[PDB]
Amino acid sequence: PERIDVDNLPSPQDVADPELPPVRATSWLLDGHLRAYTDDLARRLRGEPNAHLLHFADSQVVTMLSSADPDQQARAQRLLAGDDIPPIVFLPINQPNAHWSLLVVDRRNKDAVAAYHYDSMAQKDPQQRYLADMAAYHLGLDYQQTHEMPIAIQSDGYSCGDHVLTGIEVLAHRVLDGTFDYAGGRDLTDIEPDRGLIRDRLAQA
Amino acid sequence: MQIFVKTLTGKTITLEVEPSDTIENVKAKIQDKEGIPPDQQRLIFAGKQLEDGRTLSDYNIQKESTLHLVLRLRG
């Protein structure tokens, strides 16, 4: 006996991590940090016009798209590419224990889907675009059509996560203003990430 | 007794553990088999995260149980 409660368990990626280390001035960002930031952002945009078009994807779900288990990758596609899923999706792309980069997919036009990849590294790694291609491939897109877009070049070896979070926040406010669609609307050449503001968001959330 | 550990990329890791084994000890076995340091491993069972200082028996984990291994991704 000694019955164990299994009534309505969360999926593994939604289980909390109470031992999640705090972020500092020079540490690399973790996936738990990225999600805490986007969970708070989605809350700050709630009720604003056009906020219903955005969806910030969990990085763990981005990796499940390439899972060898077919049930897992099907769950990821239901979470990222369904009829009730917002058409503008932000996918964090992780090179394990190395780098972070951003991939955006816009599905407003179902007969022509646009994809944008942002990589803040000075000399780009072919392996990073490869992982962005796998994500688009598993989302039913042609990876050859993904655009390699401009973003501010990191001047340290730890703020690639900051560039990802800042680009997500900056672009989201452009969807709210309607400037996302102007010429150069998806250009992030002039962003300036702020470690202190990011730490502030995580504290007061 | 043999337990199973499933990652989110579709890999199952099998282990030969004892009920008296600690959570930290199980993680070292996973390090031995896959090279992942224990500072990155998050073991999950019945939708709950396991504390390093408890035992497999404390969580009523029986033979052939399935655990989830979620990683702390960094960059």
- What element of type H or E holds A24? none
Q: Which of B7, B8, B65 to mutate to test binding with chain A, by most A CBs within 10 Å of its CB?
A: B8
- Burial class of residue A174 (count of CB atoms within 10 Å of its CB; 0-12, 13-18, 19+): middle
| A-chain residues near B11 (CB < 8 A) | 68
Query: Into how many domains does chain B fold?
Result: 1
Answer whether B35 touches A (CB < 8 Å).
no
Contact B46 A9 (CB under 8 A): yes
Q: Does B11 touch chain A (CB under 8 A)?
A: yes
**What resolution does the deposited structure have, in angstroms?**
2.9
Counting every residue written for chain A, the total comes to 205
Domain count, chain A: 1
Burial readout A45-70 (b: 16 or more C-beta within 10 A, e: otherwise)? beeeeebebbbbbbbbbbbbbbbebe
Q: Which residue of B has its CA nearest to A59?
A: B73
How far, in Å, CA of A94 to CA of A131, rounded? Answer: 8
* Closest CB from B60, B70, B73 relative to A94: B73
Method: X-ray
Q: Any idea what the CATH number is for the domain that residue A7 is in?
A: 3.40.395.10
- Beta strand B2-7 with B41-45 is unpaired
Which residues contact residue A128 at a Cβ distance below 8 angstroms, ignoring those fewer than 6 apart?
A93, A95, A99, A101, A119, A121
Distance CA A34, CA A119 (A): 16
- The domain in which residue B72 lies consists of 1-75
**Mode of pairing for the β-strands spanning A147-149 and B2-7:** unpaired
Nearest to B74 among A16, A17, A30 (CB): A30
Helices (H), A2-154: 31-45, 59-64, 70-80, 126-138
In chain A, the residue whose alpha carbon lies closest to the alpha carbon of B9 is A67
* A6/B46 Cβ within 8 A: yes
Range of the domain at A33: 1-205
